[PDB]
Amino acid sequence: AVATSPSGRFLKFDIELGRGAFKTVYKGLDTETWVEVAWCELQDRKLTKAEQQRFKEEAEMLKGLQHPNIVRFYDSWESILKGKKCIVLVTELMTSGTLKTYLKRFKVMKPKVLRSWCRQILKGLQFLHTRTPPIIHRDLKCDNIFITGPTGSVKIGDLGLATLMEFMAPEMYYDESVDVYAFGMCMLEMATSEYPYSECQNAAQIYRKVTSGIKPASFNKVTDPEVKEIIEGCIRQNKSERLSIRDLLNHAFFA
Numbered sequence: 001a002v003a004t005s006p007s008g009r010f011l012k013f014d015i016e017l018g019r020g021a022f023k024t025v026y027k028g029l030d031t032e033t034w035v036e037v038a039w040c041e042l043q044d045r046k047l048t049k050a051e052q053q054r055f056k057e058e059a060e061m062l063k064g065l066q067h068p069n070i071v072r073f074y075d076s077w078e079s080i081l082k083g084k085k086c087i088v089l090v091t092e093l094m095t096s097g098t099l100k101t102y103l104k105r106f107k108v109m110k111p112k113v114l115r116s117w118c119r120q121i122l123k124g125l126q127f128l129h130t131r132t133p134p135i136i137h138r139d140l141k142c143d144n145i146f147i148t149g150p151t152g153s154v155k156i157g158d159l160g161l162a163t164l165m166e167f168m169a170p171e172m173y174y175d176e177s178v179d180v181y182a183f184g185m186c187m188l189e190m191a192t193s194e195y196p197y198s199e200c201q202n203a204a205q206i207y208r209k210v211t212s213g214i215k216p217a218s219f220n221k222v223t224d225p226e227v228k229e230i231i232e233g234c235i236r237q238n239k240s241e242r243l244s245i246r247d248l249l250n251h252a253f254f255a
């Protein structure tokens with residue numbers, strides 16, 4: 001081990017597992033439960049500013065979260081790794097990758113898989129929203145939903161990342177329904193096996209359509225109507241008109 005949590009509860013090894021542009025993920029270890037864990041270091045190039053406090057309280061609440069469909073959050077602190085002031089988070093290690101990576105590999109999701117996994121995402125979001133205070137992901141997307149295994153379940157990740165900062169809900173040019181729009185677009189990717197708004201060339205062409213509430217071409221490729229019906233009720237332009245997660249979970253398709 002070349003580094004440790006202030007708590008002494010966690011150990012960093014010198015073995016990189018991923019390299020986002022803004023972060024790095026090492027393999028690490030919970031001395032307490034002897035389970036292998038993820039040691040995420042993200043440059044504070046964000047200059048979080050005295051909003052550091054906001055994260056502290058966010059991060060503290062995130063430790064309080066435990067649910068089958070939320071990747072667990074263990075710890076965070078501020079260190080100076082490299083020359084750069086940065087932030088280290090410690091979170092449950094997910095080995096079997098993302099929904100994004102899964103789609104490519106299999107290149108088509110079986111409608112039975114999609115139901116079970118999407119339901120699970122709803123269940124996760126439901127947990128987050130029913131917290132006090134409510135937690136909004138603000139950033140739900142396919143590469144930060146993680147699977148247990150190819151035959152397994154999903155867990156929403158990149159929870160903390162959400163604070164320190166592309167298709168996002170139209171109104172947003174936060175609140176519970178921003179995540180409903182996200183989920184909708186996720187389920188469309190999961191249904192059409194391809195990325196929403198692929199047709200567009202530049203970001204602005206996407207922003208154009210989103211603003212003027214034009215749906216992605218993907219939308220039409222949706223085979224099953226009952227799914228399409230749902231995705232529809234999700235990516236509705238007016239905040240007010242979109243379904244809630246309750247509405248989606250109480251849906252016939254789901255439970």
Ligand SMILES: CCOC(=O)C1CCN(c2cc(C)c3c(OC)cc(OC)cc3n2)CC1
Pocket residue numbers: 017018025038040070071072073089091092093094095096097156157158159160161
């Ligand atoms: C073979 C490829 O697989 C990998 O290496 C994975 C890379 C991404 N991983 C992460 C990363 C981050 C920043 C997370 C995070 O940030 C707040 C939160 C989180 O839930 C609370 C889970 C997270 N899980 C785990 C390992």
